[PDB]
């Protein structure tokens, strides 16, 4: 059994948000939800965190997949990368919020742009690390190549926070039409 937390960067410069819903509809269909089967909260971040729902909300898939369908870009300037993660951490992966005694977490990072606090970086990770939670990271190149920016140091610091072994746990993803692409390796790592 799999508990699940998607943290998502709503951020402005990713669009079409279509096809952020549409990843998060084609790997969500793959999966059996359910109390004893895999559970999905997702967190929404940009310039601060939502709980789009818990853990524990829904019991089945096609509740999931009509919930993720109707969750809307929040939008934001810069990238709390940092404390979305934080959130899904010490608040999505909390009992309180469905989590489940002795079941493995995992969660799936993703994310268009280098965060502002890049700095607590390190310790959100680390207390991840301390707290086995297994963790996908996606970096979509789409917004940068868009602004001719460099890559290099986003694309290290979204490889930083997946789980070793990075080729594993990692995913650059070119563009937002590129994302649906990923998502039945995505699906085998998550549940290998
Ligand atoms: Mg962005």
Known sequence: QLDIVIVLDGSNSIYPWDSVTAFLNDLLKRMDIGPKQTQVGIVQYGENVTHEFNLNKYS?????LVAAKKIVQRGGRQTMTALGTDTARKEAFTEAR???RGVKKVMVI?????????????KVIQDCEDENIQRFSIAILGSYNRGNLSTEKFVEEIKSIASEPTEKHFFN???????????????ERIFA
């Open 60 to 64: 089945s898939t096609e509740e999931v």
């Open 110 to 122: 993703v994310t268009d742009g280098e965060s502002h606090d890049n700095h607590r970086l390190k």
């Open 98 to 100: 469905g989590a489940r």
């Open 173 to 187: 993803v070119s563009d937002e039409l590129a994302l649906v692409t990923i998502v039945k390796t995505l699906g």
